């Protein structure tokens, strides 16, 4: 359902700085429509979104011993809200 | 000098592709024959 769509938050110098300007960044399910993501974030956080952007991200191909393989392809979503609305569980961070 | 192999995604797919191979009995016969050999690479679209 809703909660299924949001795999994880993005953790990195970039993303923190973004939330410090009130802009948050989530690892999403690769098939997700932007509207689906928008709605999902709203329900999960009771926050009105004014802007989204997304990006499909090919997973790094790495090797373990003789075994060459690919990590899961992902999708990154960046959202910016109105009203300087924040999200607590990820703001203190 | 210009060499034989000159990469082209659409070429390769349209020529050695799964849809291509399925479009004909002889290509179907490749598909089956390959499956049988246990190839990881059934067909070019597997790359």
């Amino acid at each position: 359902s809703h909660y299924d769509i949001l795999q994880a938050p993005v953790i990195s110098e970039k993303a923190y700085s973004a939330m410090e300007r009130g802009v948050y960044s989530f690892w999403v399910s690769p098939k997700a429509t932007k509207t689906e993501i928008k709605d999902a974030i709203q329900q999960a956080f009771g926050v009105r979104v004014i802007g989204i952007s997304t990006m499909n991200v090919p997973g790094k191909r790495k090797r373990v011993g003789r075994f060459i393989g690919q990590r899961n392809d992902r999708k990154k979503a960046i959202v910016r809200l109105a009203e300087g609305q924040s999200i607590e569980a990820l703001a203190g961070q | 000098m210009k060499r034989t192999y000159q990469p082209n995604n659409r070429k390769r797919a349209k020529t050695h592709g799964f849809r291509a191979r399925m479009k004909t009995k002889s290509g179907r016969n490749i598909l089956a024959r390959r499956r049988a050999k246990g190839r990881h690479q059934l067909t070019v679209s597997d790359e």
Partner: protein, 66 residues
């Protein structure tokens, strides 16, 4: 709990129990991805519960139409 606790309740209560479980699983995903996730097991456990729920409401909905 797997058998008892589920069947006794309404199919409109299932939707709710499901939803809440989903939500907890996501919380645990954020935590885990940020660290540490002190209790991994809970994840899997919650997973199971979800399954049970959907199994039950399936079973029941087809046993009430027997």
């Amino acid at each position: 709990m797997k058998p008892s606790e589920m069947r006794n309740l309404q199919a409109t209560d299932f939707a709710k129990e499901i939803d809440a479980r989903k939500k907890e699983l996501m919380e645990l995903r954020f935590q885990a991805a940020a660290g540490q996730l002190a209790q991994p097991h809970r994840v899997r456990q919650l997973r199971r519960e979800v399954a049970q729920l959907n199994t039950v409401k399936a079973e029941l909905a087809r046993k009430g139409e027997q």
